[PDB]
């Protein structure tokens, strides 16, 4: 009679690369890199984004007349902004510390708009001013959240006002300065020429005078407005004073949530779907440690790597009764990885060592978890904006991100290749060790046939075979061997 020791083989075409060899077909493998996304912009954590459409952040907060639908925005999960928006500053100008403000908004999910300086308080100034540049349906206008203060009759009294932040939380206040294209314009609008705008809080102290000069026309106007902003802390008072050229805020914005968010650049719109990880190309529903969808994501996402595949072998080299492991792999043993195949007078059979397979199995599942559970995820907005005078900082930020990406891509690929090699050698050692376990138990009561099979020198029925396949056997007799 005889028993042989063997490895399961299969009908798998799954291939895994290792350090020493490539295209190793294996019986089982796990792909740990996520390559699929929905193609849709979803509600992160079930809360929809702020959809600015063609509005820029400055347009939104200043009240560009074309952003009238953004005048009572509810809580957002992330901000969705188009690149190169149109509804920015309707009146040409610039916004100071703009990138820094956009950064601030990565921590804001909702604002409460508060009327800090009602436009009808300015009883000594004209507050009905506007221009064709901000016109609505041909009707000249101005930013919705601000008051352009000009002369009343022929006078421009010093304009004063203040606000003491009793709103319950730190507030964002935006105001600006008008810089005329001429002196005649300065006199027509403000009467006074040697003007200034003065603003301060317990921490801010600024005074600015307008620059009157000829400039190229933008949106039909030669003049420009500059906007500045500050956060007024709780219980602090902001004081405004002006002799001309002041664009006063009417509203401030109380920061109501202060949670973690971010600004995503995309040309799409919100779809009716949900996600825990949103990329600009669409949401990602996954459990894997790595993805290769897009470098910038908002949410708690798998790590991004520059690779096509990360596949861990979990199974045996797939190499397709009589012959044992040395020749190849039994298609028949589908009840485990390692096992016995045997024959006697009672029956041909096939079997799996359950002890060996279970230990090997747990080794492999621990291996996979040791790789995938070591990745540390977190919420990250992954993105910053820089001005055109900050190239040395933008490039520094880029280098940092590219540097870490190369490190992690490299580590992911080398760990996978090194582990796949060990996995396949692990399985090869386990079948060889099984052969020796049995060989030692059988000693001289069998003949080794040289192909992973032991021929018996005595009759060995199913009871005799079962015990061998379990670690029990002793026959110091029947020396047919002579």
């Amino acid at each position: 009679d005889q028993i042989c020791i063997g490895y399961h083989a299969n009908n798998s075409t799954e291939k895994v690369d290792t350090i020493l060899e490539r295209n190793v077909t294996v019986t089982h493998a796990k792909d740990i890199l996520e390559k699929t996304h929905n193609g849709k912009l979803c509600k992160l954590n079930g809360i929809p984004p702020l959809e600015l459409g063609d509005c820029s952040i400055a347009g939104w907060l200043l009240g560009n007349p074309e952003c009238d639908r953004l005048l009572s925005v509810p809580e957002w999960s992330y901000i969705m902004e188009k690149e190169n928006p149109r509804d920015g500053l309707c009146y040409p100008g610039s916004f100071n510390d703009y990138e820094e403000l956009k950064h601030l908004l990565s921590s804001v999910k909702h604002f409460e708009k508060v009327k800090i300086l009602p436009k009808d308080r300015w009883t000594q100034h004209t507050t009905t001013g506007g221009s064709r540049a901000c016109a609505v349906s041909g009707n000249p206008s101005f930013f919705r959240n601000m008051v352009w203060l000009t002369k009343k009759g022929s006078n421009y009294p010093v304009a004063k006002g203040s606000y003491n932040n009793t709103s319950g939380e730190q507030m964002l206040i935006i105001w600006g300065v008008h810089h005329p294209n001429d002196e005649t314009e300065q006199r027509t609008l403000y009467q006074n020429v040697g003007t200034y705008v003065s603003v301060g809080t317990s921490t801010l102290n600024k005074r600015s005078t307008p620059d009157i000069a000829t400039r190229p026309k933008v949106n039909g106007q030669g003049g420009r407005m500059e906007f500045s902003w500050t956060l007024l802390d709780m219980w602090d008072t902001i004081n405004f004073e002006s002799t001309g050229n002041l664009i006063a805020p009417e509203y401030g914005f109380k920061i109501s949530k202060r949670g973690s968010s971010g600004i995503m650049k995309t040309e799409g719109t919100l779809e009716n779907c949900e996600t825990k990880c949103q990329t600009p190309l669409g949401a990602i529903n996954t459990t894997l440690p790595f993805h290769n969808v897009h470098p910038l994501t908002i949410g708690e996402c798998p790590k991004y790597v520059k690779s096509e595949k990360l596949v861990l072998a979990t199974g045996l080299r797939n190499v397709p009764a009589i012959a044992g492991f040395i020749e190849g792999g039994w298609q028949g043993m589908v009840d485990g990885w390692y096992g016995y195949h045997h024959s006697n007078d009672q029956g041909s059979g096939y079997a799996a060592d359950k002890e060996s397979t279970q230990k090997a199995f747990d080794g492999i599942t621990n291996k996979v978890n040791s790789v995938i559970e070591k990745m540390n995820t977190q919420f990250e907005a992954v993105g910053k904006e820089f001005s055109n005078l900050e190239r040395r900082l933008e490039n520094l930020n880029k280098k940092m991100e590219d540097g870490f990406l190369d490190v992690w891509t490299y580590n992911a690929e080398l760990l996978v290749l090194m582990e796949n090699e060990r996995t396949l050698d692990f399985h090869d050692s386990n079948v060889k060790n099984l052969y020796d376990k049995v060989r030692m138990q059988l000693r001289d009561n069998v003949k080794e046939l040289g192909n992973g099979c032991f021929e018996f020198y005595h009759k060995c029925d199913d009871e005799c075979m079962n015990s061998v396949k379990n670690g029990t056997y002793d026959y110091p007799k029947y020396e047919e061997e002579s």
Partner: antibody, heavy 130, light 112 residues
């Protein structure tokens, strides 16, 4: 003062049109706008519309949207008003007026719309009848 | 469209104070807009009498003075003279109907 010279009276039939015009003493180059005001006999004043020749901008009273056209040609320094779909009710005198309130500038634009008429034309009577 | 309501007429003897009211609304006398006043003699184009709700053009007598509060306004003529027989009108800018200027109904002033 500022001279604004208005065209004379005209008689028109219902279903036709009316053309009234005023030559301004440089108001089509300087920056004061030109407005049209109507007054039916025995009635008060009605605003009809305006032009700002500096920018080529116009604005009309709601009652005449689609009926009133205002244009100007600064080379002759004249503002024109054209009324269509003329009816028997359009027997009012028409006046031009200079807005001495909102002063405009080139390479910019700004209105407060708190202006007033400092200089008026003479008044062109238009009679509409069969 | 003819929002600024004025009394059909007012009157008084020479030497008396005569006032003309102008009542508007939240869209045009309110909303910070100023009211101008004009003086019109029969057969003649109206002329500016008061502007900015208080100031007078050069050539206008001190006897004419404007006043404004809330959504209401008035013109005061003191020292009424025999020659002050004219229709008076108030004007302001109305923000409704995409914007228009509104003149009032007019007041006739009769000297007794």
């Amino acid at each position: 003062q500022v001279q604004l010279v208005q065209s004379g009276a005209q008689l028109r039939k219902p279903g036709s049109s009316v053309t009234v015009s005023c030559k301004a003493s440089g108001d089509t180059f300087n920056s004061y706008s030109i407005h049209w005001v109507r007054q039916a006999p025995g009635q008060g004043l009605e605003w009809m519309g305006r032009i700002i020749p500096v920018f080529g901008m116009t604005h009309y009273a709601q009652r005449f949207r689609g009926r009133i056209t205002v244009s100007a040609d600064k080379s002759t320094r004249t503002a024109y008003m054209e009324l269509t779909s003329l009816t028997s009710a359009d027997t009012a005198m028409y006046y031009c007026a200079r807005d001495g309130g909102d002063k405009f500038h080139s390479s910019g634009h700004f209105e407060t719309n708190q202006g007033y008429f400092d200089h008026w034309g003479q008044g062109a009577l238009v009679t509409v009848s069969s | 469209q003819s929002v600024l309501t004025q009394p059909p007429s007012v009157s008084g003897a020479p030497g008396q104070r005569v006032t003309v009211s102008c009542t508007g609304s939240s869209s045009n006398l309110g909303a910070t807009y100023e009211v101008h006043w004009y003086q019109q003699f029969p057969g003649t184009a109206p002329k500016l009498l008061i502007y900015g709700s208080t100031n007078r053009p050069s050539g206008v007598p001190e006897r004419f003075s404007g006043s404004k509060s809330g959504t209401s306004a008035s013109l005061t003529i003191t020292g009424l003279q025999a020659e002050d027989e004219a229709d008076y009108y108030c004007q302001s800018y109305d923000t409704s109907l995409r914007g228009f200027y509104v003149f009032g109904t007019g007041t006739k002033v009769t000297v007794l």
